[PDB]
Design a protein around this ligand. Structure first.
Ligand SMILES: N#C/C=C/c1cc(Cl)cc(Oc2ccc(Cl)cc2OCCn2ccc(=O)[nH]c2=O)c1
Lengths: 405, 538
């Protein structure tokens, strides 16, 4: 009910970021939405005296045909002063990833009940573009806490604590976490009882997505088991083991390479010796152990790499320093994406980001196997999430693709 | 006197830590001074400016060209920061279109009263025997940093209610002008234009061109649009500036005119920082510019946009990294046209370029028409299928169909996913000495076939490529090749159909002639038999 003063970093000016072109339907959607928000005092029109701008577009969430307004706050978020409160950086609920099940909710509606600091408002300015530059764009600024801003959950945090206070004391089996406009709820319960408890919590919030963290793991490196090996099979094996030797200490390929001696046809069957079998065995044993000295550093950045395996299959690795993997995984998910690579990639990026939010409490920086222009053209069409991560583009094909397959 | 509606000023500040500009006044001739005195007199009479005293330390220099000229550049530097032309092909066909240019645009809009003191200027007295006459602006100065933004914001503010009340008409605004249009009867249309002029007059904005309109390099006609005639400068000595100008004009003409090629002339401008130099031209460039003058012979027009019809885009491969496109809702009548040039790169293929062109056209179309056009592309459905399914990067094209207009984009070769049975297996290698630049490249096979070729003026990468190439030359229609080179494999896994390197192009030519090629990689120096670094190490 009273605005908490918000400032910027020491010497960072507010965001000026070009608005990208929007399709006619998204423009209309934003017009209707922003008109309704203008009536409700959530946003207000501004004049040329405001130089700052932040991009804006429109999305559609799951099971809903209603347009949602998405603002890209990345620039503002990084330029926004690092937010520390009386919470003092509340420690990430490391039990959240250990939970049987986790449900994600959209609490953004609440953020619009809290007024925004008057001096900071000028930094939230955005532009609704017009087709073919026929009329000047409609510019607004936020009078309240905008969704997508990192300052909004930080500010509303105390209120959120006071609201969730009764529910937390009632059942101390439940882990509650908050990231941006999304609220995560962990439980050990059963899906039906879980959903009834979710309805209970929702109507509990009214008076004021289903995930399974336990069903993931950290993927081991596997080697083939064959009765007969060809020259090609062994060559690939040696390649993969040599690659894995950057990961694990004691991998040794010499007795396997010893089989490849002489110049032979690729399809010729080569019987394994005793030394070679022993070596492959010791290598398997080595690969079964975890990776030596792998730690998470909250100060550093999370890096996510993604490879396209084809046929809807995608692989990914989340790491901080090279060849030390904090998490690795595979995404086969098929919903309506079968004919579109970019949609698949977008959904994959969303899922990986969500996993990362659950585990480390922060989004990683993606490296995408896609040209910049393709991604930048098509990604907003498939994006269902309130947040956005950082990303970059790898234009050189990785040799290591199959070794994760 | 009917009360005029007040125009609310826009609050304006300087940059933080900066103060207002202070600049000494330039000495002027007596005639200039008299002219300035007269002009400023009538301006003060009109209320546009006000006389001030010694209490204002700030001074902005002034000249007389009559017409008063105030130079705000310093004030512009110390003034704060303030917040793409419409394309004719995006305009919708209208039975009536009226143009209104508001006169005294900036002087009809008041200036923030606190900022006025910074606009202060001084007229020098005759023979410098008297204190100069002091003045300040009460309205938006001409040449001030914040004038256009404030003006257009005020204009939009004023225009809002009239537009909401008149859905049957559409009002576009560019800078100082309003372009109104409607499908109504000419009488009703002109009447509503009168009403609009009255509404603008209510706020104290004075308003008065008939087709064809000459606007921003274009020509607008009721049923059609084109570009103002393009003049290509003719001189025996072509300089860098002349090539920049020519490239600009040709790029400008390429929107309406199909088939414009800027590649040679733009290629001539690489790494040139200079103005006057005489640069020759290849026969390619000359024939290109001659063909450009050939395309510019009989002028062509674009049409306007009809929302009820599908938007179609068609692409042709022009050769040498060049692509051209047309956008139309109907056969033989183009909304507009254009071109795309491939990005700077070492290697490339047709499919990637086609994709990039599609993205470009998509973005442009979203800008102009607010939608994605349906594509007609010179590529088979099966080709695109194979390409995107087997490509390591994610890739997508929006809704499209195959049109057969050669040259067709195709996949020139495909590597096998598995080793070939019965095919000879070539283990290849190459190596070079860093200092002497001496190297060797060759292969050994399973059938006993071997080769080692010595090479001068080379490197490791080139000897590896050369090794692979040797394997391709000496082998049958089906072949297995084993390399330790991550560089070569990295090049081939990108699937170029063309390269800057001649060696890579030779390799490509070899791959094209092959029925089946399987390329396999192994780590170097791992003691993998058949892989010989020792033949090339000598
Ligand atoms: N100078 C200048 C004007 C420049 C100018 C600039 C722009 Cl952005 C638009 C414009 O005219 C139009 C204004 C408003 C509408 Cl709804 C359509 C228009 O169609 C344009 C197509 N058209 C053009 C002329 C004509 O007679 N009939 C017609 O339908 C004029």
């Amino acid at each position: 009910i009273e605005t908490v003063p918000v400032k910027l970093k020491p010497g960072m000016d507010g965001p000026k970021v070009k608005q990208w072109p929007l399709t006619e339907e998204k423009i209309k959607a934003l017009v209707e939405i922003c008109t309704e928000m203008e009536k409700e005092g959530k946003i207000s029109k501004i004049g040329p005296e405001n130089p700052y701008n932040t991009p804006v577009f429109a999305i559609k969430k799951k099971d809903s045909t209603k347009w949602r307004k998405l603002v890209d706050f990345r620039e503002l978020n990084k330029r926004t002063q690092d937010f520390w409160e009386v919470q003092l950086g509340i420690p990430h609920p490391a039990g959240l990833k250990k939970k049987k099940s986790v449900t994600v909710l959209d609490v953004g509606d609440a953020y619009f009940s809290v007024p925004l600091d008057e001096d900071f408002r000028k930094y939230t300015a955005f532009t609704i573009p017009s087709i073919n530059n026929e009329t000047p764009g409609i510019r607004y600024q936020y009078n309240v806490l905008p969704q997508g801003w990192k300052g909004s959950p930080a500010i509303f945090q105390s209120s959120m604590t006071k609201i969730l206070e009764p529910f937390k004391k009632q059942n101390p089996d439940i882990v509650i976490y908050q990231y941006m406009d999304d609220l995560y709820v962990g439980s050990d319960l059963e899906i039906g009882q879980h959903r009834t408890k979710i309805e209970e919590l929702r109507q509990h919030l009214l008076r004021w997505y289903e995930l399974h963290p336990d069903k993931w793991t950290v993927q081991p490196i596997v080697l083939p088991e064959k009765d007969s090996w060809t020259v090609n099979d062994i060559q690939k094996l040696v390649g993969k083991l040599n690659w894995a030797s950057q990961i694990y200490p004691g991998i040794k390929v010499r007795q396997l390479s010893k089989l490849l001696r002489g110049t032979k046809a690729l399809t010729e069957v080569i019987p394994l010796t005793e030394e070679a079998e022993l070596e492959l065995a010791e290598n398997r044993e080595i690969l079964k152990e975890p990776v030596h000295g792998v730690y998470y550093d909250p100060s550093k950045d999370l890096i996510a790499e993604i490879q396209k395996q084809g046929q809807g299959q995608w692989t990914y690795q989340i790491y901080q320093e090279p060849f030390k993997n904090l998490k690795t995984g595979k995404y086969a998910r098929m919903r309506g994406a079968h004919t579109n690579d970019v949609k698949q990639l977008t959904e994959a990026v969303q899922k990986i980001t969500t996993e990362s939010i659950v585990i480390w409490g922060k989004t990683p920086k993606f490296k995408l196997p896609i040209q910049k222009e393709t991604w930048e053209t098509w990604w907003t069409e498939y994006w269902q999430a309130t947040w956005i991560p950082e990303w970059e583009f790898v234009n050189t094909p990785p040799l290591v693709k199959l070794w994760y397959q | 006197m009917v009360p005029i509606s007040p125009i609310e000023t826009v609050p304006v500040k300087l940059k933080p830590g900066m103060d207002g500009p202070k600049v000494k006044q330039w000495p002027l001739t007596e005639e200039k001074i008299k002219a300035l005195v007269e002009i400023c007199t009538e301006m003060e009479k009109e209320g546009k400016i006000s006389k001030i005293g010694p209490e204002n330390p700030y001074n902005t220099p002034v000249f007389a060209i009559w017409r008063k000229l105030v130079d705000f550049r310093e004030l512009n530097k110390r003034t704060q920061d303030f917040w793409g032309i419409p394309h004719p092909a995006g305009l919708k066909k209208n039975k009536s279109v009226t143009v209104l240019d508001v006169g005294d645009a900036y002087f009809s809009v008041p200036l923030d009263e606190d900022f006025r003191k910074y606009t202060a200027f001084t007229i020098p007295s005759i023979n410098n025997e008297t204190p100069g006459i002091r003045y300040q602006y009460n309205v938006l100065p001409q040449g001030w940093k914040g004038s256009p933004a404030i003006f257009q914001s005020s204009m939009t503010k004023i225009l809002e209610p009239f537009a909401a009340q008149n859905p049957d008409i559409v009002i576009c605004q560019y800078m100082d002008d309003l372009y109104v249009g409607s499908d109504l009867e000419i009488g009703q249309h002109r009447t509503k234009i009168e009403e609009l002029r009255q509404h603008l007059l209510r706020w104290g904005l004075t308003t008065p061109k008939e087709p064809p309109f000459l606007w921003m390099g274009y020509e607008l006609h009721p049923d059609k649009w084109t570009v103002q005639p393009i003049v290509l400068p003719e001189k025996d000595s072509w300089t860098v500036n002349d090539i920049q100008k020519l490239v600009g004009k040709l790029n400008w003409a390429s929107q309406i005119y199909p088939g414009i090629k800027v590649r040679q002339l733009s290629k001539l401008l690489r790494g040139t920082k200079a103005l006057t130099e005489v640069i020759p031209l290849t026969e390619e460039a000359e024939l290109e510019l001659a063909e450009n003058r050939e395309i510019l012979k009989e002028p062509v027009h674009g049409v306007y946009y009809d929302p009820s019809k599908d938007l179609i885009a068609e692409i042709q491969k022009q050769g040498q990294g060049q692509w051209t496109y047309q956008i139309y809702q109907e056969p033989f009548k183009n909304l507009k046209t254009g071109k795309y040039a491939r990005m700077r790169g070492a290697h490339t293929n047709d499919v990637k370029q086609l994709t990039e062109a599609v993205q470009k056209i998509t973005t442009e179309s979203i800008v102009i028409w607010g939608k994605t056009p349906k594509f007609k592309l010179p590529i088979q459905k099966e080709t695109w299928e194979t390409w995107w399914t087997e490509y390591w990067q994610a890739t997508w094209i929006p809704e499209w169909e195959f049109v057969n207009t050669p040259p067709l984009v195709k996949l020139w070769y495909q590597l096998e996913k598995e080793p070939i049975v019965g095919a000879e297996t070539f283990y290849v290698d190459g190596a070079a000495n860093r200092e002497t630049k001496l190297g060797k490249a060759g292969y050994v096979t399973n059938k006993g076939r071997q080769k080692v070729v010595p090479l001068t003026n080379t490197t490791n990468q080139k000897t590896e490529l050369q090794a692979i190439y040797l394997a391709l030359q000496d082998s049958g229609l089906e072949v297995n090749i084993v390399t330790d080179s991550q560089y070569a494999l990295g090049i081939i896994q990108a699937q170029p159909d063309k390269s800057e390197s001649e060696l890579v192009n030779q390799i490509i030519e070899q791959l094209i002639k092959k029925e089946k090629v399987y390329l396999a990689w192994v780590p170097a120096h791992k003691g993998i038999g058949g892989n010989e670094q020792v033949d090339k190490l000598v």
